Amino acid sequence: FNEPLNIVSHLNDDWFLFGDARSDCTPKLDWLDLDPKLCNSGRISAKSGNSLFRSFHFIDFYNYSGEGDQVIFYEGVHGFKCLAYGDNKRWMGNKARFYARVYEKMAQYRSLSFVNVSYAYGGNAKPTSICKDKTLTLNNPTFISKESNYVDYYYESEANFTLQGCDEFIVPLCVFNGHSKGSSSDPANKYYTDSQSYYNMDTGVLYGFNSTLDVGNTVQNPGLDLTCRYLALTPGNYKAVSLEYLLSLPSKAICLRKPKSFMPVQVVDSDNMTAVACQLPYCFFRNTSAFHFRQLLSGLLYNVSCIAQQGAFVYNNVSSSWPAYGYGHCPTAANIGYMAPVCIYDSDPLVPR
Amino acid sequence: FNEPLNIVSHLNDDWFLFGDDPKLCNSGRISAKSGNSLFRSFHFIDFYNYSGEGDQVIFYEGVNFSPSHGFKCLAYGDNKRWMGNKARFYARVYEKMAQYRSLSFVNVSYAYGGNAKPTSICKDKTLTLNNPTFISKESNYVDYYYESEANFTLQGCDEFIVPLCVFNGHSKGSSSDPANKYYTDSQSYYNMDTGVLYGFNSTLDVGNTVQNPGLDLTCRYLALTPGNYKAVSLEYLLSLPSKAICLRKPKSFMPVQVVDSDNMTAVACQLPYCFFRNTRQLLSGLLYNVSCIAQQGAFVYNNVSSSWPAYGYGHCPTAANIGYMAPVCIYDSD
Numbered sequence: 042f043n044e045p046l047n048i049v050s051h052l053n054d055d056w057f058l059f060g061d062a063r064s065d066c067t068p069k070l071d072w073l074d075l076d077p078k079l080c081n082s083g084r085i086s087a088k089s090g091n092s093l094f095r096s097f098h099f100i101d102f103y104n105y106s107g108e109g110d111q112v113i114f115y116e117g118v119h120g121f122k123c124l125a126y127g128d129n130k131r132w133m134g135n136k137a138r139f140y141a142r143v144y145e146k147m148a149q150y151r152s153l154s155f156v157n158v159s160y161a162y163g164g165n166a167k168p169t170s171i172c173k174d175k176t177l178t179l180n181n182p183t184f185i186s187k188e189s190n191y192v193d194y195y196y197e198s199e200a201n202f203t204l205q206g207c208d209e210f211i212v213p214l215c216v217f218n219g220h221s222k223g224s225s226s227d228p229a230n231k232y233y234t235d236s237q238s239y240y241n242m243d244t245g246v247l248y249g250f251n252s253t254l255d256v257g258n259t260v261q262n263p264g265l266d267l268t269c270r271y272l273a274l275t276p277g278n279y280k281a282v283s284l285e286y287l288l289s290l291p292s293k294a295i296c297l298r299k300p301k302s303f304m305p306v307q308v309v310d311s312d313n314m315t316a317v318a319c320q321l322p323y324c325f326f327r328n329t330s331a332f333h334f335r336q337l338l339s340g341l342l343y344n345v346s347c348i349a350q351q352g353a354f355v356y357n358n359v360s361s362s363w364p365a366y367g368y369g370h371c372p373t374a375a376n377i378g379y380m381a382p383v384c385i386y387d388s389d390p391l392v393p394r
Numbered sequence: 395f396n397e398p399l400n401i402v403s404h405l406n407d408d409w410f411l412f413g414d415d416p417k418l419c420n421s422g423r424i425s426a427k428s429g430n431s432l433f434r435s436f437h438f439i440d441f442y443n444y445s446g447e448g449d450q451v452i453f454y455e456g457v458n459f460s461p462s463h464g465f466k467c468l469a470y471g472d473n474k475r476w477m478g479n480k481a482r483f484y485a486r487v488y489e490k491m492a493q494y495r496s497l498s499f500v501n502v503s504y505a506y507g508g509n510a511k512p513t514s515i516c517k518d519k520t521l522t523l524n525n526p527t528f529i530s531k532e533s534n535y536v537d538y539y540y541e542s543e544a545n546f547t548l549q550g551c552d553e554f555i556v557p558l559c560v561f562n563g564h565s566k567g568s569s570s571d572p573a574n575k576y577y578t579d580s581q582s583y584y585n586m587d588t589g590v591l592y593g594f595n596s597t598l599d600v601g602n603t604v605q606n607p608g609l610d611l612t613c614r615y616l617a618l619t620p621g622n623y624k625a626v627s628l629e630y631l632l633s634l635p636s637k638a639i640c641l642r643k644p645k646s647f648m649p650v651q652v653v654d655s656d657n658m659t660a661v662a663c664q665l666p667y668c669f670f671r672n673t674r675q676l677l678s679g680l681l682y683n684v685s686c687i688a689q690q691g692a693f694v695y696n697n698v699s700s701s702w703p704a705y706g707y708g709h710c711p712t713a714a715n716i717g718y719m720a721p722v723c724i725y726d727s728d
């Protein structure tokens with residue numbers, strides 16, 4: 042009785058679901074209408090063909106926003122690389138590290154949204170879309186061109202940006218990891234070591250990242266691509282300091298607001314980078330099966346009593362399993378006493394109790 | 395029935411206590427030295443070789459680095475900087491000991507190219523700091539506007555806690571310098587394998603005179619993976635770790651338990667990685683197992699209770715409406 046169920050769910054109505062499916066509600070005989078009731082729900086933010094990761098890094102932005110105590114993620118659907126001879130594995134790594142940070146922090150905050158980050162840069166040089174391919178163009182982090190008067194990429198360069206209005210922000214700190222090239226006119230042995238740092242101007246804390254690999258962007262030596270760390274930053278005034286190659290800084294941040302009592306996120310799939318990202322204590326991964334977004338919605342109509350490592354317990358009283366990492370009102374697997382002294386209602390002259 | 399008890403305890407024999415009843419001294423599950431603490435051993439010469447391993451880890455110490463004794467690096471320094479250091483330190487140890495079985499100390503060595511050596515720059519009349527080590531300038535430099543560096547390797551543990559510190563203020567080199575001459579301390583650690591850099595610049599303008607007091611050492615506490623590291627100093631005295639907290643043997647997340655002049659440990663001890671317990675009858679909980687350890691306290695029995703355990707660990711009772719299964723029962727009979 043009350044076996045744990047392998048599904049994402051909620052304890053009450055205070056939940057929110059981020060998705061990459063079609064969220065909208067797309068008849069005298071009402072059983073022909075196949076929209077689930079939660080279609081168009083204000084507890085769902087979802088766009089077919091997009092995702093938090095895509096909107097965080099690329100031009101085809103969708104304005105994901107949501108607030109809830111129990112946050113749920115539906116993750117679903119060659120691969121992206123910055124350069125013709127890049128490496129998509131770096132992007133699989135970026136994705137795992139992004140969602141690790143998003144999943145972890147959404148166990149601590151009610152509210153997620155995106156904000157645009159502006160910068161102040163003292164030079165004349167402008168942004169350049171250095172990282173792209175045939176279907177997608179990267180715009181976060183922004184990359185700033187060489188000043189016309191510098192003859193090569195061996196220069197220092199900085200810009201200011203401010204983060205305001207949220208408790209914490211998730212931003213990308215990235216470098217091209219390998220032998221970066223300034224131009225194809227250059228010699229083969231002339232390469233650069235991308236180096237980037239963010240500096241809190243008030244606290245004096247520096248987050249830095251130096252390129253360390255030897256890969257490049259040719260058929261003989263391929264692999265050069267963007268490696269990103271995802272930083273959770275407090276609000277304040279920051280300076281992006283580049284010691285070599287192109288200055289990069291954030292153009293978009295995930296805004297985190299409204300702290301809650303720690304409540305693990307729940308994640309479900311239709312790569313396994315979301316699986317790698319979803320770890321205890323901050324995330325419960327569910328490998329649910331019949332898995333369409335439309336089936337998820339129907340499965341989110343009713344509450345459950347307890348959400349735990351093994352799954353969802355519908356009922357709050359007893360189970361054959363002991364809940365581990367339980368949240369909510371969790372059942373016991375103790376077997377219940379047959380009798381106690383309250384039970385008998387008369388003293389027997391000849392039998393003991 | 396089965397109200398939660400405001401005590402520290404264990405779910406089984408797999409527990410350990412760090413600190414400063416006779417029965418438990420023989421248990422082989424205590425590491426404690428009167429007059430000392432983890433923080434104190436981390437930073438100072440008065441070192442105790444704390445060491446212990448367990449699934450449920452308990453801490454009962456911190457008092458032996460108070461504000462009433464009150465340490466500062468300089469005559470006109472600031473103990474509150476050291477209070478803040480304490481909070482950050484214990485925040486990191488508590489969070490990490492929810493994830494690892496074993497805690498211990500290791501000594502960290504370095505390679506440095508110059509002839510200059512350690513200087514005990516931070517000390518009061520009854521305590522000398524040796525972690526981080528500070529390396530004095532080369533005799534050939536007349537000012538302190540230089541770049542100094544040393545290598546150090548971290549080996550033998552899954553993670554290491556080390557201090558990254560700067561003097562935060564208008565740091566002085568010698569009294570012979572004019573008042574207007576001063577330094578802005580800058581320290582960083584660089585992982586040569588990964589390319590990740592952690593840096594820290596002084597941002598305050600306070601000093602070490604009666605007229606402008608407050609210059610002391612501010613430390614961040616980094617959890618680093620094993621590898622080859624480089625301490626890079628861009629100004630003032632080079633500093634790098636001499637001791638590290640050695641974290642070993644990963645475990646399924648199990649919150650630490652903490653019991654008690656200051657409340658830095660209370661700030662350090664936060665859900666979900668730590669359970670703080672107020673006020674011995676609290677330490678008596680180590681004599682026996684309990685079924686469930688939760689935010690409200692320890693639940694002795696694993697079946698029923700009047701409270702719903704929150705952040706429960708073990709075999710946790712329900713607070714549903716349940717009675718006894720015998721047909722003879724009426725009051726409380728399911």
Ligand SMILES: *[C@@H]1O[C@H](CO)[C@@H](O[C@@H]2O[C@H](CO)[C@@H](O[C@@H]3O[C@H](CO[C@H]4O[C@H](CO[C@H]5O[C@H](CO)[C@@H](O)[C@H](O)[C@@H]5O)[C@@H](O)[C@H](O[C@H]5O[C@H](CO)[C@@H](O)[C@H](O)[C@@H]5O)[C@@H]4O)[C@@H](O)[C@H](O[C@H]4O[C@H](CO)[C@@H](O)[C@H](O)[C@@H]4O)[C@@H]3O)[C@H](O)[C@H]2NC(C)=O)[C@H](O)[C@H]1NC(C)=O
Pocket residue numbers: 376377378380381382383393394395695697698716717718
């Ligand atoms: C959840 O689990 C708990 C813990 O296991 C369980 O509580 C136990 O229930 C069992 C079975 O009912 C109790 O055992 C019975 O005790 C009968 C005597 O009852 C009196 O004495 C009890 C012993 O008291 C001493 O020890 C306890 C600590 O152990 C200590 O607190 C006391 O101070 C004292 O030193 C006493 O606990 C008990 O008190 C309970 O019941 C009264 C009366 O209703 C109530 O007022 C109290 O609030 C409290 O709930 C009472 O004072 C004894 O006659 C009986 O023996 C018969 O049956 C057994 C088999 O069942 C035969 O072996 C025997 O031959 C007899 O036929 C039996 O031993 C046990 O004492 C409980 N323990 C505790 C700590 O409460 C709950 O029932 C479980 N609940 C559910 C829903 O499953």
Ligand SMILES: *[C@@H]1O[C@H](CO)[C@@H](O[C@@H]2O[C@H](CO)[C@@H](O[C@@H]3O[C@H](CO)[C@@H](O)[C@H](O)[C@@H]3O)[C@H](O)[C@H]2NC(C)=O)[C@H](O)[C@H]1NC(C)=O
Pocket residue numbers: 196197234235236251284285584591624626
């Ligand atoms: C992380 O990356 C940056 C960029 O590579 C490093 O900064 C650069 O370090 C190199 C090598 O030490 C320096 O090159 C030197 O240039 C000077 C001229 O000033 C010359 O005398 C040397 O022979 C050498 O060619 C370069 O100056 C320096 N650039 C800047 C802007 O500081 C940085 O050191 C790396 N971080 C770590 C921790 O290694």
Ligand SMILES: *[C@@H]1O[C@H](CO)[C@@H](O[C@@H]2O[C@H](CO)[C@@H](O[C@@H]3O[C@H](CO)[C@@H](O)[C@H](O)[C@@H]3O)[C@H](O)[C@H]2NC(C)=O)[C@H](O)[C@H]1NC(C)=O
Pocket residue numbers: 356358359377715716728
């Ligand atoms: C834990 O909670 C659940 C749900 O509240 C309890 O299960 C429910 O138990 C009731 C009472 O026993 C069941 O109703 C009865 O069912 C029997 C047999 O079918 C019937 O003869 C009675 O006339 C009455 O309808 C109910 O079906 C059942 N619900 C479910 C979903 O299974 C359970 O008993 C609780 N367990 C304990 C130990 O408290």
Ligand SMILES: *[C@@H]1O[C@H](CO)[C@@H](O[C@@H]2O[C@H](CO)[C@@H](O[C@@H]3O[C@H](CO)[C@@H](O)[C@H](O)[C@@H]3O)[C@H](O)[C@H]2NC(C)=O)[C@H](O)[C@H]1NC(C)=O
Pocket residue numbers: 240247282540541578579580595627628629
């Ligand atoms: C954090 O602290 C370090 C150490 O103070 C900063 O590096 C230092 O920055 C100062 C201020 O820009 C540099 O001063 C310059 O000195 C040169 C000659 O030495 C002079 O030609 C310039 O006009 C200027 O006065 C200093 O060189 C530099 N030190 C080193 C070793 O690189 C660092 O910039 C701070 N970090 C951030 C992110 O602000």
Ligand SMILES: *[C@@H]1O[C@H](CO)[C@@H](OC2O[C@H](CO)[C@@H](O)[C@H](O)[C@H]2NC(C)=O)[C@H](O)[C@H]1NC(C)=O
Pocket residue numbers: 161162163200201242
């Ligand atoms: C980025 O931020 C700098 C402030 O630290 C600023 O540099 C200064 O110019 C401001 C403007 O009045 C001065 O108040 C200040 O003295 C300067 N810097 C320092 C450290 O004191 C830069 O100008 C800003 N960059 C851009 C492009 O606006």
Ligand SMILES: *[C@@H]1O[C@H](CO)[C@@H](O[C@@H]2O[C@H](CO)[C@@H](O)[C@H](O)[C@H]2NC(C)=O)[C@H](O)[C@H]1NC(C)=O
Pocket residue numbers: 052053054342343344
């Ligand atoms: C899931 O639980 C929530 C919170 O308990 C339910 O909200 C309750 O709604 C019913 C009427 O529909 C009321 O009896 C309660 O007072 C409501 N709670 C609050 C806090 O106002 C919600 O109904 C449940 N969802 C489902 C599908 O049963």
Ligand SMILES: *[C@@H]1O[C@H](CO)[C@@H](O[C@@H]2O[C@H](CO)[C@@H](O)[C@H](O)[C@H]2NC(C)=O)[C@H](O)[C@H]1NC(C)=O
Pocket residue numbers: 405406407681682683
């Ligand atoms: C707490 O529980 C532990 C483990 O369940 C108990 O350790 C057991 O003790 C018995 C009796 O000495 C041994 O026969 C078992 O083999 C022990 N198991 C282990 C894993 O060590 C311990 O006795 C309990 N403590 C108390 C006070 O009851």
Ligand SMILES: *[C@@H]1O[C@H](CO)[C@@H](O[C@@H]2O[C@H](CO)[C@@H](O)[C@H](O)[C@H]2NC(C)=O)[C@H](O)[C@H]1NC(C)=O
Pocket residue numbers: 443444445498499500550640
């Ligand atoms: C201080 O404690 C440490 C850690 O427990 C001791 O170092 C360990 O010693 C054992 C052998 O007893 C070795 O197998 C381990 O490799 C050591 N651990 C580490 C991290 O190096 C050390 O011996 C103790 N020092 C003294 C003087 O007793």
Ligand SMILES: *[C@@H]1O[C@H](CO)[C@@H](O)[C@H](O)[C@H]1NC(C)=O
Pocket residue numbers: 104105106154155
């Ligand atoms: C996008 O969402 C943000 C945060 O929820 C909101 O403030 C803003 O109205 C939205 N922007 C647009 C263009 O709709």
Ligand SMILES: *[C@@H]1O[C@H](CO)[C@@H](O)[C@H](O)[C@H]1NC(C)=O
Pocket residue numbers: 104155156157
């Ligand atoms: C950021 O920019 C995009 C497109 O320029 C816009 O639609 C979005 O609403 C902006 N976010 C905010 C918080 O204004």
Ligand SMILES: *[C@@H]1O[C@H](CO)[C@@H](O)[C@H](O)[C@H]1NC(C)=O
Pocket residue numbers: 441443499500501
């Ligand atoms: C580190 O050094 C201290 C003081 O000399 C010593 O007592 C301790 O045993 C050393 N630790 C290790 C792991 O060698």
Ligand SMILES: *[C@@H]1O[C@H](CO)[C@@H](O)[C@H](O)[C@H]1NC(C)=O
Pocket residue numbers: 505506507544545
């Ligand atoms: C530190 O390591 C670097 C790289 O391995 C090496 O070039 C240098 O000689 C080392 N410095 C010292 C002082 O040993």
Ligand SMILES: [K+]
Pocket residue numbers: 235236237283284285286287288289
């Ligand atoms: K750069």
Ligand SMILES: [K+]
Pocket residue numbers: 579580581627628629630631632633
């Ligand atoms: K320094």
